[PDB]
């Protein structure tokens, strides 16, 4: 679910999902169009595509379970949708962690008109 994803983000990065990743660049938090602004935005682009691989799942609300094995996120077995949603969220959280070194506040609340053109998943 979106709240679990937010918690995973905070755990991974130490940033609050809202406002750090809810309106960032072209693809974080609301998605749509455009060339992703930077690596963090590409994490969200890929996450959006990941959700898009699951048209009959409901990632905003469906809850999954995961644990930590040392640092590492391990998705625990639920329904097929929950397993796949968890793997999408795990990847995005890891991606955000891997790109914290570039994260730029200038891309928070990024205006929609600066995001044009379709980029295929």
Curated annotation (Swiss-Prot):
Q: Which GO terms describe its cellular component?
A: extracellular region
Q: What cofactor is needed?
A: Ca(2+)
Q: What does this protein do?
A: Snake venom phospholipase A2 (PLA2) that shows weak neurotoxicity and medium anticoagulant effects by binding to factor Xa (F10) and inhibiting the prothrombinase activity (IC(50) is 130 nM). It also damages vital organs such as lung, liver and kidney, displays edema-inducing activities when injected into the foot pads of mice and induces necrosis of muscle cells when injected into the thigh muscle. Has a low enzymatic activity. PLA2 catalyzes the calcium-dependent hydrolysis of the 2-acyl groups in 3-sn-phosphoglycerides.
| Entries under InterPro entries matching the protein | PLipase_A2 (IPR001211), PLipase_A2_Asp_AS (IPR033112), PLipase_A2_dom (IPR016090), PLipase_A2_dom_sf (IPR036444), PLipase_A2_His_AS (IPR033113)
Leftover remarks: D.russelli pulchella is synonymous with D.russelii.
What reaction does this enzyme carry out catalytically? a 1,2-diacyl-sn-glycero-3-phosphocholine + H2O = a 1-acyl-sn-glycero-3-phosphocholine + a fatty acid + H(+)
Carries keyword Transmembrane?
no
- Key word Metal-binding present in the record? yes
EC identifiers of the protein: 3.1.1.4
Its name, as the record gives it, is Basic phospholipase A2 VRV-PL-VIIIa
Q: Give the SMART domains listed for this entry.
A: PA2c
The entry's localization annotation reads:
Secreted
């Amino acid at each position: 679910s979106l709240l679990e994803f937010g918690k995973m983000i905070l755990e991974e990065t130490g940033k609050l999902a809202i406002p750090s990743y809810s309106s960032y660049g072209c693809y974080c938090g609301w998605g749509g169009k455009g060339t992703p602004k930077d690596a963090t935005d590409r994490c969200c682009f890929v996450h959006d595509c990941c959700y898009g691989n699951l048209p009959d799942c409901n990632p905003k609300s469906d809850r999954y379970k995961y644990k930590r094995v040392n640092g590492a996120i391990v998705c625990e077995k639920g329904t097929s949708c929950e397993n796949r949603i968890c793997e999408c969220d795990k990847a995005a959280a890891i991606c955000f962690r891997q790109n914290l070194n570039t994260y730029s506040k200038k891309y928070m609340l990024y205006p929609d008109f600066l995001c044009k053109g379709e980029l295929k998943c």
